[PDB]
Amino acid sequence: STKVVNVAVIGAGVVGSAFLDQLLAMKSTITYNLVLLAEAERSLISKDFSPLNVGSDWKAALAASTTKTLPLDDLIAHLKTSPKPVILVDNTSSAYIAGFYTKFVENGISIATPNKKAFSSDLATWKALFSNKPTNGFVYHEATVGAGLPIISFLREIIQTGDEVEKIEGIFSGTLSYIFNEFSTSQANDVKFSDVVKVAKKLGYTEPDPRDDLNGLDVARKVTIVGRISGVEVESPTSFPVQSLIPKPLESVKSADEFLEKLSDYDKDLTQLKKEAATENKVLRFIGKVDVATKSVSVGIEKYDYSHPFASLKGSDNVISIKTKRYTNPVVIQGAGAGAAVTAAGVLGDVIKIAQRL
Amino acid sequence: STKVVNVAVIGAGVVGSAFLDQLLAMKSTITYNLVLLAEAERSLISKDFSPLNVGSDWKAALAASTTKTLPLDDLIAHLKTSPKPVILVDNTSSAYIAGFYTKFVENGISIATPNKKAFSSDLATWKALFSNKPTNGFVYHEATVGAGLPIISFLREIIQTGDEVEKIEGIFSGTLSYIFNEFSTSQANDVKFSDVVKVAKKLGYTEPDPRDDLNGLDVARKVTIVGRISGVEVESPTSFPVQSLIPKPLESVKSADEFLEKLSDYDKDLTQLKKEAATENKVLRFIGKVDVATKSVSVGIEKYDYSHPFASLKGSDNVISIKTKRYTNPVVIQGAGAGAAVTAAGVLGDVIKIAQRL
Ligand SMILES: NC(=O)c1c[n+]([C@@H]2O[C@H](COP(=O)(O)OP(=O)(O)OC[C@H]3O[C@@H](n4cnc5c(N)ncnc54)[C@H](O)[C@@H]3O)[C@@H](O)[C@H]2O)ccc1[C@H](O)C(=O)C[C@H](N)C(=O)O
Ligand code: NA
Ligand code: NA
Numbered sequence: 001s002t003k004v005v006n007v008a009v010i011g012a013g014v015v016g017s018a019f020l021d022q023l024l025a026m027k028s029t030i031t032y033n034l035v036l037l038a039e040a041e042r043s044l045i046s047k048d049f050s051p052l053n054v055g056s057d058w059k060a061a062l063a064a065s066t067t068k069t070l071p072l073d074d075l076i077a078h079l080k081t082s083p084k085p086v087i088l089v090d091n092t093s094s095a096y097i098a099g100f101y102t103k104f105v106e107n108g109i110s111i112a113t114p115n116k117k118a119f120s121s122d123l124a125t126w127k128a129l130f131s132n133k134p135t136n137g138f139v140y141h142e143a144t145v146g147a148g149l150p151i152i153s154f155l156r157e158i159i160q161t162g163d164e165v166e167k168i169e170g171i172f173s174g175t176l177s178y179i180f181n182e183f184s185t186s187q188a189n190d191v192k193f194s195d196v197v198k199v200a201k202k203l204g205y206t207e208p209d210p211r212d213d214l215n216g217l218d219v220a221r222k223v224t225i226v227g228r229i230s231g232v233e234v235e236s237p238t239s240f241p242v243q244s245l246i247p248k249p250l251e252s253v254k255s256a257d258e259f260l261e262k263l264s265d266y267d268k269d270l271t272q273l274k275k276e277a278a279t280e281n282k283v284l285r286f287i288g289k290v291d292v293a294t295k296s297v298s299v300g301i302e303k304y305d306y307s308h309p310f311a312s313l314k315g316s317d318n319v320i321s322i323k324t325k326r327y328t329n330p331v332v333i334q335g336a337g338a339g340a341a342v343t344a345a346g347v348l349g350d351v352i353k354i355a356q357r358l
Numbered sequence: 359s360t361k362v363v364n365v366a367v368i369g370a371g372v373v374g375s376a377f378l379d380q381l382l383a384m385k386s387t388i389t390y391n392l393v394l395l396a397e398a399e400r401s402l403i404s405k406d407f408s409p410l411n412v413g414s415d416w417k418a419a420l421a422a423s424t425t426k427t428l429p430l431d432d433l434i435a436h437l438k439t440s441p442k443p444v445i446l447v448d449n450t451s452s453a454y455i456a457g458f459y460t461k462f463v464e465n466g467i468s469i470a471t472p473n474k475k476a477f478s479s480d481l482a483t484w485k486a487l488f489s490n491k492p493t494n495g496f497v498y499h500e501a502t503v504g505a506g507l508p509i510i511s512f513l514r515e516i517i518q519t520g521d522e523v524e525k526i527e528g529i530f531s532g533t534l535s536y537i538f539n540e541f542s543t544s545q546a547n548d549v550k551f552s553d554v555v556k557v558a559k560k561l562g563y564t565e566p567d568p569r570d571d572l573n574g575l576d577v578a579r580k581v582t583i584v585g586r587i588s589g590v591e592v593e594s595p596t597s598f599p600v601q602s603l604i605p606k607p608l609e610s611v612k613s614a615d616e617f618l619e620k621l622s623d624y625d626k627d628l629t630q631l632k633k634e635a636a637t638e639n640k641v642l643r644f645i646g647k648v649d650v651a652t653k654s655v656s657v658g659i660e661k662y663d664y665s666h667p668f669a670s671l672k673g674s675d676n677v678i679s680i681k682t683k684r685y686t687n688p689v690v691i692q693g694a695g696a697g698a699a700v701t702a703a704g705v706l707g708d709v710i711k712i713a714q715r716l
Binding site for chain 1: 359360380383384386387490506507508509511512515516518519520521544664665666667669670672673675680684685687688689690691692693694697699700703706707710714715
């Protein structure tokens with residue numbers, strides 16, 4: 001009969017709920033059997049390995065559960081006794097959970113996740129991605145760079161095909177892109193930096209503390225990932241230039257709220273640089289850059305021309321320009337690099353790819 | 359994943375030669391055994407299914423072959439007994455070979471191809487193709503539109519996750535894309551359509567007869583495919599408005615060389631269109647619109663603000679915009695939608711996806 005694959009999910013946040021929904025709704029010829037779901041301490045564990053009885057509302061089911069969440073080692077031991085191939089869907093961003101990735105992998109358990117942690121830390125844990133071992137499951141992380149856009153898979157494909165990436169540059173942060181699309185445009189603009197980031201925060205786009213977006217470390221993580229798949233064995237997300245948008249004097253301030261009240265005090269610079277670029281009929285963008293030839297990598301601001309693909313983005317789109325041996329002219333892929341629905345579809349799509357390979 | 363699979367390639371032309379080279383020279387965790395190298399009159403065929411012993415120089419091998427190419431009814435009669443899954447790679451524009459797809463699939467053999475034929479035919483073939491019945495070959499055609507750009511596989515994924523396409527539209531023809539990107543730009547120019555069509559020809563962007571490109575027919579078949587992938591049951595590439603760039607009729611009435619030389623008599627029309635639109639800060643582009651709600655697939659010229667990305671294309675690149683319930687703001691993918699090595703990569707990309715799935 002039907003081919004089955006058992007799924008174990010950790011986290012039911014914004015991305016995790018979208019994923020679960022889409023997952024439980026997905027029509028297909030392969031059977032995606034939800035056997036586990038974990039959110040904080042409460043957890044649904046189908047000891048039997050039959051589909052979790054979520055009835056028609058896994059939310060309530062997850063609520064009324066009194067099954068404590070299994071310690072990680074116990075999570076592996078459990079999963080290891082499944083009648084079918086297991087796929088762990090880590091919807092968290094816990095570097096803790098990321099520490100067990102290689103343990104999960106090495107025990108035949110596969111992984112699909114938007115979690116950037118394991119993939120943008122030391123090179124040897126990344127090297128662990130070399131799951132060519134016969135006893136370990138697969139590792140997919142599309143939602144890890146650019147939500148659900150056909151990016152990492154497109155690189156792995158052409159590369160295997162025989163192509164060679166040369167230069168990759170793009171916009172990998174939703175928040176940062178939104179800010180720059182609202183701040184630096186093609187038309188006359190008198191908007192202050194402090195205000196755009198002030199609003200992005202209010203709409204709920206920035207992290208609880210926007211300083212966590214402005215230090216450009218999250219894009220540096222994504223860049224670290226693209227750079228590696230691209231052949232530039234980047235040591236860490238911090239081992240290369242990364243321009244911080246945070247005013248040095250506001251680097252050590254008590255609250256995310258003191259930051260916002262005080263930030264206004266430094267519009268000066270960017271207001272001028274924004275202007276300067278206006279004169280040159282250019283725009284300002286926060287990008288990541290990977291130059292395979294010179295093994296150089298970096299993230300920061302850069303002025304782009306109006307006819308440039310990067311000057312024509314909507315809302316908070318992400319963008320990635322891919323230049324390769326056969327692609328003299330970049331393949332440039334653009335679209336939403338954040339949002340629950342979009343991202344979950346990325347995680348699930350990796351679920352699909354993996355379940356077929358099983 | 360799956361250790362061993364058999365590749366049955368048909369056609370060693372522009373695309374075909376590049377595919378072969380790339381395949382043969384590919385290093386992977388899976389073994390791809392070439393069990394067939396078929397051409398117009400002669401074919402290389404591994405009667406007992408051993409890897410065709412054609413190291414890297416297959417041409418010399420094919421050449422010395424006097425083994426006549428097997429009619430498709432006999433061919434699949436052979437391949438169907440293969441001890442390993444069989445991936446038929448059709449690198450032809452053959453309607454003949456296309457008519458057979460349904461039989462390959464029913465006999466359990468998958469298909470990887472850039473051949474638009476079976477997918478821009480009647481609705482029954484399409485349904486049959488994706489009937490996705492047990493033990494039946496899978497059918498991949500990433501190269502039928504946009505060469506090797508991640509679009510078809512992107513759509514089939516987003517759709518499976520649960521997303522719905524609402525508005526697709528793109529520049530699916532390199533020769534046309536080239537002409538217009540050249541013809542009408544943001545920077546006003548005194549360029550005559552006829553002069554661009556002819557230069558494009560001399561530079562080889564065209565087919566011996568530029569009418570084979572101006573009739574907008576290839577753009578129609580490519581949109582018939584996307585339309586269907588999106589939920590519009592298009593009866594055929596000829597069941598909707600398909601504006602021709604050929605000087606209104608006056609088609610059959612002439613011939614090759616004459617068409618061109620006489621073409622420079624209608625320019626005034628298009629030149630005027632290029633002007634008016636220019637007044638609106640817009641440009642001209644030959645596209646393939648696709649509206650799902652209204653279920654309206656069209657083809658022809660359309661205006662685009664300079665701001666728009668369809669307005670800043672490079673060389674003869676392809677573009678496609680994808681609005682969905684989830685991506686309310688279009689996912690734009692642009693890049694070479696033609697080219698020996700890029701088109702072939704797209705085909706081998708599908709091969710990899712299929713081998714992995716078997
Ligand atoms: N080269 C490209 O860039 C490109 C080409 N394709 C598709 O790729 C396929 C092959 O292309 P290509 O190699 O250039 O054409 P070839 O003329 O070289 O044909 C390949 C071989 O097929 C063999 N053949 C025909 N019938 C056969 C049979 N019954 N048995 C065995 N062998 C047989 C012939 O002997 C021939 O040598 C076509 O279906 C084409 O439509 C797919 C997409 C792109 C492209 O977007 C496009 O088609 C549009 C156009 N190029 C544009 O510029 O906009
Ligand atoms: Na992605
Ligand atoms: Na494509």
